[PDB]
Amino acid sequence: IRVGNAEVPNHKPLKTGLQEVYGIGRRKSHQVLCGLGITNKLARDLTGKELIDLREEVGMHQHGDELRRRVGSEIQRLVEVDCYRGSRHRHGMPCRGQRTKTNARTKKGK
Amino acid sequence: DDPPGKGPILRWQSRIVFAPGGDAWHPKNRKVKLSVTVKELGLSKHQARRLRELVGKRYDSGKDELTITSERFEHREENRKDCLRTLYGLIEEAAKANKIAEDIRTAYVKQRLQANPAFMQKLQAKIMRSK
Amino acid sequence: STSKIKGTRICIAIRSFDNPEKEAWCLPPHSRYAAMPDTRTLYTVLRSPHVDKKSREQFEMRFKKRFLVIKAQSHELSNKLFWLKRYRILGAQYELQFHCKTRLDMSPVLGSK
Amino acid sequence: DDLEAGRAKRLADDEKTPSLDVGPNGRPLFTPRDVTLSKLSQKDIGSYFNFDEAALKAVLPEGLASGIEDEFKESWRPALLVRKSFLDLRDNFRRIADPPMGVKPKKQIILDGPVKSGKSIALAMLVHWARDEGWLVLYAPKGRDWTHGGYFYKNQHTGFWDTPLQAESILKDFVKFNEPRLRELRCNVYDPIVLGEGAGVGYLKGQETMPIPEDSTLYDLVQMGINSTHAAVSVVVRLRKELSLVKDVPVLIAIDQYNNWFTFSEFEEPVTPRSCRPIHARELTTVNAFRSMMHDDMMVGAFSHSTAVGKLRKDLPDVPADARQNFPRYSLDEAEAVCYYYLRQRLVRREVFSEENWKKIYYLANGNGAEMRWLVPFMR
Amino acid sequence: VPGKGKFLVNDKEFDVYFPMLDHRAALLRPLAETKTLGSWDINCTVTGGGTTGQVGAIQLGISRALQNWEPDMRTALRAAGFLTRDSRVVERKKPGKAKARKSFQWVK
Amino acid sequence: SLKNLVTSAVTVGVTEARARIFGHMLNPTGQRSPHKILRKKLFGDKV
Amino acid sequence: MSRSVWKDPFVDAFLMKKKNAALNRKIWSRRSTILPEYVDSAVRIYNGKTHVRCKITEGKVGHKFGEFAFTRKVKKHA
Amino acid sequence: GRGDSKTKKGKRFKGSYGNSRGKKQKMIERIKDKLELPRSTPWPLPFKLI
Amino acid sequence: XXXXXXXXXXGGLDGEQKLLIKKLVNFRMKEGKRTRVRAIVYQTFHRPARTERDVIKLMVDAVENIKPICEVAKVGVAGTIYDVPGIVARDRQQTLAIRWILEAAFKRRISYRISLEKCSFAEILDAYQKRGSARRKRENLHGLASTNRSFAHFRWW
RNA sequence: UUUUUUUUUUAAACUCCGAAACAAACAAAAAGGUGCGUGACGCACUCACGAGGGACUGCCAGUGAUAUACUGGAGGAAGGUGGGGAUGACGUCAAGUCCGCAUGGCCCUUAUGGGCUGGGCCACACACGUGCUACAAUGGCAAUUACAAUGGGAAGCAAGGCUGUAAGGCGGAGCGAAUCCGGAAAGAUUGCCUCAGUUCGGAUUGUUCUCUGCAACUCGGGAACAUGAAGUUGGAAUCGC
Numbered sequence A: 001i002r003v004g005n006a007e008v009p010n011h012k013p014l015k016t017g018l019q020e021v022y023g024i025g026r027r028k029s030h031q032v033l034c035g036l037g038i039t040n041k042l043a044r045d046l047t048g049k050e051l052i053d054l055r056e057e058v059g060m061h062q063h064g065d066e067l068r069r070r071v072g073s074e075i076q077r078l079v080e081v082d083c084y085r086g087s088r089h090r091h092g093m094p095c096r097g098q099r100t101k102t103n104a105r106t107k108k109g110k
Numbered sequence B: 001d002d003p004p005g006k007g008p009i010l011r012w013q014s015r016i017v018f019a020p021g022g023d024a025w026h027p028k029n030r031k032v033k034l035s036v037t038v039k040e041l042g043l044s045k046h047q048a049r050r051l052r053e054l055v056g057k058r059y060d061s062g063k064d065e066l067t068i069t070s071e072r073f074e075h076r077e078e079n080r081k082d083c084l085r086t087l088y089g090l091i092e093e094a095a096k097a098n099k100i101a102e103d104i105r106t107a108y109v110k111q112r113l114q115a116n117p118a119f120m121q122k123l124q125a126k127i128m129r130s131k
Numbered sequence C: 001s002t003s004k005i006k007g008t009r010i011c012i013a014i015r016s017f018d019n020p021e022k023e024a025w026c027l028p029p030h031s032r033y034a035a036m037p038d039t040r041t042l043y044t045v046l047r048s049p050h051v052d053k054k055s056r057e058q059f060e061m062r063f064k065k066r067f068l069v070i071k072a073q074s075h076e077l078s079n080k081l082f083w084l085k086r087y088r089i090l091g092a093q094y095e096l097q098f099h100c101k102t103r104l105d106m107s108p109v110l111g112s113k
Numbered sequence D: 001d002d003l004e005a006g007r008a009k010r011l012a013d014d015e016k017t018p019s020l021d022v023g024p025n026g027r028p029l030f031t032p033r034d035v036t037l038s039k040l041s042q043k044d045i046g047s048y049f050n051f052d053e054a055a056l057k058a059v060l061p062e063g064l065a066s067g068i069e070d071e072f073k074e075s076w077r078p079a080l081l082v083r084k085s086f087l088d089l090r091d092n093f094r095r096i097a098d099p100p101m102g103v104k105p106k107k108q109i110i111l112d113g114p115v116k117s118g119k120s121i122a123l124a125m126l127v128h129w130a131r132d133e134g135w136l137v138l139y140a141p142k143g144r145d146w147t148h149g150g151y152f153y154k155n156q157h158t159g160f161w162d163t164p165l166q167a168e169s170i171l172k173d174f175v176k177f178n179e180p181r182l183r184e185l186r187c188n189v190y191d192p193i194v195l196g197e198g199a200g201v202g203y204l205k206g207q208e209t210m211p212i213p214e215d216s217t218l219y220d221l222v223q224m225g226i227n228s229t230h231a232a233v234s235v236v237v238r239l240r241k242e243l244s245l246v247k248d249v250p251v252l253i254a255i256d257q258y259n260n261w262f263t264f265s266e267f268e269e270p271v272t273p274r275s276c277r278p279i280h281a282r283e284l285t286t287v288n289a290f291r292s293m294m295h296d297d298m299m300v301g302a303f304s305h306s307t308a309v310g311k312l313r314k315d316l317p318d319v320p321a322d323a324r325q326n327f328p329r330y331s332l333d334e335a336e337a338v339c340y341y342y343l344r345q346r347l348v349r350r351e352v353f354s355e356e357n358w359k360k361i362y363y364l365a366n367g368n369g370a371e372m373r374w375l376v377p378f379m380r
Numbered sequence E: 001v002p003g004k005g006k007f008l009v010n011d012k013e014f015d016v017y018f019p020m021l022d023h024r025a026a027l028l029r030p031l032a033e034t035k036t037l038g039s040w041d042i043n044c045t046v047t048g049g050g051t052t053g054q055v056g057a058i059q060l061g062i063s064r065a066l067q068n069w070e071p072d073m074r075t076a077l078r079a080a081g082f083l084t085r086d087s088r089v090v091e092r093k094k095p096g097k098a099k100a101r102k103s104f105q106w107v108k
Numbered sequence F: 001s002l003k004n005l006v007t008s009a010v011t012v013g014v015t016e017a018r019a020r021i022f023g024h025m026l027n028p029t030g031q032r033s034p035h036k037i038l039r040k041k042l043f044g045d046k047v
Numbered sequence G: 001m002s003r004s005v006w007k008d009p010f011v012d013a014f015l016m017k018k019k020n021a022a023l024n025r026k027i028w029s030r031r032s033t034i035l036p037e038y039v040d041s042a043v044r045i046y047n048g049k050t051h052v053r054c055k056i057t058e059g060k061v062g063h064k065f066g067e068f069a070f071t072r073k074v075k076k077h078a
Numbered sequence H: 001g002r003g004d005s006k007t008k009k010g011k012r013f014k015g016s017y018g019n020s021r022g023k024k025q026k027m028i029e030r031i032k033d034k035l036e037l038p039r040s041t042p043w044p045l046p047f048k049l050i
Numbered sequence I: 001x002x003x004x005x006x007x008x009x010x011g012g013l014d015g016e017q018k019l020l021i022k023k024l025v026n027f028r029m030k031e032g033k034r035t036r037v038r039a040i041v042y043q044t045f046h047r048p049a050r051t052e053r054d055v056i057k058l059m060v061d062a063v064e065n066i067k068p069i070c071e072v073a074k075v076g077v078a079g080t081i082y083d084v085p086g087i088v089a090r091d092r093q094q095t096l097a098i099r100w101i102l103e104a105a106f107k108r109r110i111s112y113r114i115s116l117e118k119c120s121f122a123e124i125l126d127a128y129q130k131r132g133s134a135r136r137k138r139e140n141l142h143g144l145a146s147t148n149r150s151f152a153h154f155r156w157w
Numbered sequence J: 001u002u003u004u005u006u007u008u009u010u011a012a013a014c015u016c017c018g019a020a021a022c023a024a025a026c027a028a029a030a031a032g033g034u035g036c037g038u039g040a041c042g043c044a045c046u047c048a049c050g051a052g053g054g055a056c057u058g059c060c061a062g063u064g065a066u067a068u069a070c071u072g073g074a075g076g077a078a079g080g081u082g083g084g085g086a087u088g089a090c091g092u093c094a095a096g097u098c099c100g101c102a103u104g105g106c107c108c109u110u111a112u113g114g115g116c117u118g119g120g121c122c123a124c125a126c127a128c129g130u131g132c133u134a135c136a137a138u139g140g141c142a143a144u145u146a147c148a149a150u151g152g153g154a155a156g157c158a159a160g161g162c163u164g165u166a167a168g169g170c171g172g173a174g175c176g177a178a179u180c181c182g183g184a185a186a187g188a189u190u191g192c193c194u195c196a197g198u199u200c201g202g203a204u205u206g207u208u209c210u211c212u213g214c215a216a217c218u219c220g221g222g223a224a225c226a227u228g229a230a231g232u233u234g235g236a237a238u239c240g241c
C-alpha cells in the first residue's frame, strides 16, 4: 500500500510497516495506530475506510518527500548563509563538536 | 515527672554545639522542635481534621503527636518563639471548623425544608401575618 | 529498668577521631552509654608528583560517635548546664540535647475552642 | 516416537485389570461410573472423577481451561480430583438455587488463592455441574481476551470503549452451548438496539437502531449480535440486562482470569499529539456491563496469578466486601491421592515410589499442582 | 518449633519469596538430611545480599537451629557441610587494576 | 450525603491559611520565580 | 503565552545602549546574538587574529556573531 | 542497546530520564490509575495491596 | 550441590552422576547466568522422564559412548611439529564427552533452528545408539591417535 | 446426636410500654469488617561499639636421617601462609620530576615580568595505544514482580502534591544526619518479535526545547520527534585470569 510517499509491505504488520514512511518512526507509528483504534494488524487486511483514516492520520505529520526537501533546504540554507555548520556540511565534516583527529569515519568514507 | 501548673504538656528540644577554638557558631545551634499531643488540646473531630489538613505530615497518627520544628530564624530563642506562634496559629485556624460545619448543616436543613410541600404554606403565612 | 529514658533529660553526643574509651575518666557521668556506627572517608592520591598513575596510596578519615544519656529533673537543669559548658573532653566535640517540658497556656485560644 | 509408545502400551494393558486402580491405603482410586457430578458426596473426597474428552468438550464448548489441558496432557487420562473446596462451592450454589425443605450462602464469590491451587479446574467443574442441572451459564475461561486484541472505538453516547470482535466472540461462545435454551426464552426488554461503530468499517449509513421484533427470543437477539458487527457490543449489553430477568432457569456468570478486569487493557488513547494514555479495563463496554457484582445474580469470578496482572486492592471496587474466598492448595491427603494417581498413570516408576519421596516432592512444591506434576517424573 | 510443615520468610510464604525451585530445594535440604520434613513450623527473617546469599543464610540458620534443638543431629549436618559458614566474600578492588585480580591491558 | 459534605467542607480554605502560618510561598500557576535563588545562603564571604 | 523560549537571547552590554551605532566598527564579541534590528549593517568580527568582515542579512538573524568568523584555517596535507 | 539514548537501557547508561525510562512519578501515576483512585491520593496509598 | 539443587534434594545419585549433571549445566553457562541453561537441561531431563525409565542412567550410558580413550598433542621436535598420542584421564574423558555433546547440540540448533531442548535430547539420543556428530568426533580423534602411533615415545607427560 | 455421674452460675436488654416524622448519627460515649501505626515491657535476636578468645602441624597414623619436614585423618566456623590488604633490603637504570614545591649556576628586566578581551590546547590525507557500544534468540522490547552493599547531603539532599509527551518548572515533610532524603540492574512471571542488516545495532544529521553559568559560535550536559552509517564475531599477532 502506498502511504505517504512510500510502499508499506502487505505481509508485514502495520506498526512495523508504517515506519517505512519517511518522518514516521517507532513512536509515531504507535501514535497513529492508537488514533485508528487498531492494536496491530497486517497491512493487506486494512479496509477501505481504514485506508482513508490512515492517510488522514499520517497527513497530520510532516512526512515523505516534502519533509525530505525541507531537511535538504534547511541544510542548504546553512550552507548558503556560510555559518560554521554550513562550512562543516560543505567540507564533509562533523558539525556537532566531534573530534576529527581519529574518529570522523562516518562523515568521511572508509 | 509532669510539668507544673495546668494545661496540655509541651515537649521542647534544643541543641548546643560546643566547638573548640573560639568560633562557637554551628549550623545545628538554632533548630528548636516542639511536640504536643493533639488529644490534650480538647479539639473536636472537625477541628482535629482541619488541623490534620493544615499540618500534613508533621502530625504522626500512631503517637497522636504534633511536631513543629523551626529553623528559619537565625537564633535559638527566635525559633523557640516561632514554634509557639505557629502552634497558636494552627490552633486558631483549626478552631474554625465548627462554624463551617454549623453553616453547612443549617444550609442542608434549610435546603431540605424547601423540598417539602407542607412547610411553605406555614412559612408564607408566618411571613405574611407579620410582613 | 533497661527501658528507654523518655522524660526530662540531657543527651550528650561526642564525636572524635579517637575512641573516648581511651580516656574514659574525662567523660561526664551518665545513665546510658551508646555508640554510633563508624563512618570513614576514603582518600586515594598519586604517590609520585609526576606520571606514575598505577601507584596509589590510600588514606582514610574514620569518624567515631558516642551517645550519653543523663537523667535529670527540670530544676537541676541550669545547674548541670553551667558545668557542662566548661567540660574538656579529650580530642572531641560534644553536643548537648535538652528535653524539657512546659505547659501550654490555652487562655488566648480558648475562645476559639 | 517410540518414547511415549511403551508407556501408552503399558497404560492400555493396565486398564484391562481393575485391581490396579488403587489409592492410598487400599482405597479405590476412581469414583464409580454410575456417579455424576451432582451425586458426589463427602465419601468421594480424595477419589477421581473420570470424564470423556469428547463429552467434556461438548459440555464446555468455550474451550477447556489451560490447567485442565496441561493435566490431561501430562496424565494421559481425562480425570480430575474430587476436593472438599469444589464440593463446598457446589453446595453453596445448590443452596442458593433451591433452599432445602446458620451459614449464610453468598451469591457473589471471587475465587482467590495461591498460584496453581486449582481455581480454574474448580470453576470448570462448577460450570460442568451447573450445565448438568440445566442452567443458563455464560462461561468465559479466558477473561484476559475481553481486554486484549482487536479494535477499540470510543462510544459517542456512553463514553465507554467498544470492542466488536470480542463481543461477537462472546456471543458465539454463549450460543455454542445455549442454542437449545435461548430459543425458548423470550426477551423482556423491547427497546431498540443502538448501533455502534463496526470492526474497521465505521458507522452504518442511515441506520442508527435495530428494533426488537415482538416474537423475538434470546436466540434471535444473540444471532442479531452475531450477524451484524455494528450491534454486537449493544447486544452484549442487552444480553447482560436480559440475564438478570430470566425467571425459568438459574443464571450463572462464571468468569475466569477475573483480575484482568481490574487492571489496564492493551488499548491506548491518544490524548496529546506526543502522548498516549492507557485505557483501563473498566472503561470497556463489555467489562463495564459484566464486571460489577453489586446485584442479585449468581456470579463467580476466579482470579489468576499466572497472568502478570500484579497487585490489586484488598477492597476491590464494585465488589461486596465478603465476596473474596480463599481457594487452598493441596493438603497432605490430596497430595497423597495425587501421587498415587501419578503412580497409577505411570508418570513415575514403581520401583522408586515411597512415602518419603512423595512427601519430599509435596514439601518442595508447597502444594503447587503444576510443580508437583513436574516433580513426580524426577522421583528416585 | 515442631509443627506440620509451615515455612514463612519475612512474613510471607516461602514459595512466594523464593519462587524458583532450586532455591526452595536448597532451603529444604537440611530438613531432608535429618529426615525431619513436615515436623517443623519455621519462621525466619532475612535481610541483605542477593537471593542465593539469602538462601544460604537461611540454610545455615536452619542447620544451626536444628543442632540447637537436638545435638544428636549434628552428624548428618556436619557430613553434608551444612554447619560450615561459607566465608567466601567479594574481594576488594585494588588500585592500579581494573578489578580485584583483572589487570589493565599491557602493551607488549 | 450530609456526612461527606461535613468532612469535605472543613478542609477547604486551608491552602492560604497554611501559607500564612508557615510563611510559605504561594505560586498557583507555577511560573519561574526568583524565590529559589533568594532562599539559598549567600556564600561570598565563605569563598 | 506567545513566547516559545522563556530566556532572552544574549547580547553584550555595549550593544544594548548605542545599538546599530556599534556595528560599523570592529567587534570582539563573538558571543552576542544577531538581532533582527541588525540587518543591513557591516561588522568586522574578531576571530583571534584579524577582524573578519561580515555583512548582516536576513538569514543571519538568530545566530551568534562568531559563526561567521572562522578561527582555524581550513588546512591541507602535502 | 546500551548506546541507544531512546531506550531505557541507554538512558540508564546516560543516567537520564524521559519517555522510555520515566521517573518514579510515572510509576506512582500508573499504579494510581491501575487501582482506580484519584491522582490526589497521597503516596504511599492507604490501602492494602494483595 | 550449588548446581541442580533439585536433584541433590531428591538425592539418589553418586559422585559421577552429580559431576555429570554439574558439567552438563555449567559448560555452556556464560556471564554467570545459570537459570536458562539449567531450565533447558531440566526439560531435556523431563522429556524421557515422563515415559517411565531412568534418565540419569541413560545419560551415563550416553556419555560413556562418547568418552575418548586416546587423544593427541602437538610436540615440536628438531623444529618440526609432530603429533604425539596420549592417554585421556577419566575426568578429562567425561569433560570431552560432555563438551562434544553440547557442541553438537548447539550447532544443531544453529543449523536446524528448533528448540534447544529438542537438539540436546536428539544429540544425547544419537550418543545413546553410538552415532551422531559426537561419535564422529570420537572416531576422528581415535583415528588421529592411531595414525600417529609411530610418533609415540616422543611423549613427556 | 442422646443416656447418665460429678462440679459451678441464674440492673441490662425486648418485637413491651411512650414518642419522633427531619435525616440524622452530630460534644464525647454506641456496633460490625478492616488498613497503617504507637506506647508499656524489653534489647532474647540482628546490628553497632569497646575489650577478648580461637589455629599453634596443637593431637593421631604413616613415609622419612629419631631432625627439619611431607602425605592423610580427627576435632573445629576456619588446617597447614584461612581469604585479602598494608608492609618493599644493598644497590642498578646519570630512570622520571627545575611545569607541585624548594634549590646552585646561567639567562630576561618598557619584558622571557604583570592585566584584559578574543582565539587555541577540541584542527586532520594518516599511523599507534587504551576503552565504550555492538554485530543478536544463551537475544531485543513491553507489562508485572523480587533481592544489595559502599558512600553522599547546607553553594546541599529533597517526601507527598501541582504543571509539562519529556528533560524540566512550581513548592517544600524531614534532615549538618544508625533518626530525614535518590524505584539497583542482571533475575523471575506473562506477552510480542521468528533469523531479516531485522522491533538487531544507534553512528551521522535536521527541527523544537531545557539546565548550569556574565557568557554554551568555535566548544558543555540533557529532552522530544525524525533521520537510521558501519557492523553478520574480526589476518599475522597480542592481553588478562
Ligand SMILES: Nc1ncnc2c1ncn2[C@@H]1O[C@H](COP(=O)(O)OP(=O)(O)OP(=O)(O)O)[C@@H](O)[C@H]1O
Pocket (backbone or CB within 6 Å): D066, D067, D068, D070, D071, D079, D080, D081, D082, D083, D114, D115, D116, D117, D118, D119, D120, D121, D122, D303, D304, D305, D306, D307, D368, D369, D370, D373
Ligand atoms: N482437582 C484437580 N484435579 C487434578 N489436578 C488438579 C486439580 N486442581 C489442580 N490440579 C493441578 O494443579 C494445576 C493448577 O491448576 P489450575 O490451572 O486450576 O490453577 P489456578 O489455581 O487457576 O492457578 P493460576 O493462578 O495459575 O490461574 C493443574 O494444571 C493440575 O495439574
Ligand SMILES: [K+]
Pocket (backbone or CB within 6 Å): A097, A098, A099, A100, J122
Ligand atoms: K573538534
Ligand SMILES: [K+]
Pocket (backbone or CB within 6 Å): none
Ligand atoms: K596465622
Ligand SMILES: [K+]
Pocket (backbone or CB within 6 Å): J216, J219
Ligand atoms: K556550544
Ligand SMILES: [Mg+2]
Pocket (backbone or CB within 6 Å): C039
Ligand atoms: Mg555521613
Ligand SMILES: [Mg+2]
Pocket (backbone or CB within 6 Å): D067, D119, D120, D257, D303, D304, D305
Ligand atoms: Mg487459572
Ligand SMILES: [Mg+2]
Pocket (backbone or CB within 6 Å): E090
Ligand atoms: Mg565485582
Ligand SMILES: [Mg+2]
Pocket (backbone or CB within 6 Å): E090, E091, E092
Ligand atoms: Mg569488602
Ligand SMILES: [Mg+2]
Pocket (backbone or CB within 6 Å): H001, H004
Ligand atoms: Mg533497538
Ligand SMILES: [Mg+2]
Pocket (backbone or CB within 6 Å): H025
Ligand atoms: Mg515527587
Ligand SMILES: [Mg+2]
Pocket (backbone or CB within 6 Å): H029
Ligand atoms: Mg504528572
Ligand SMILES: [Mg+2]
Pocket (backbone or CB within 6 Å): none
Ligand atoms: Mg545483649
Ligand SMILES: [Mg+2]
Pocket (backbone or CB within 6 Å): none
Ligand atoms: Mg585434614
Ligand SMILES: [Mg+2]
Pocket (backbone or CB within 6 Å): none
Ligand atoms: Mg636522565
Ligand SMILES: [Mg+2]
Pocket (backbone or CB within 6 Å): none
Ligand atoms: Mg625525560
Ligand SMILES: [Mg+2]
Pocket (backbone or CB within 6 Å): none
Ligand atoms: Mg585569557
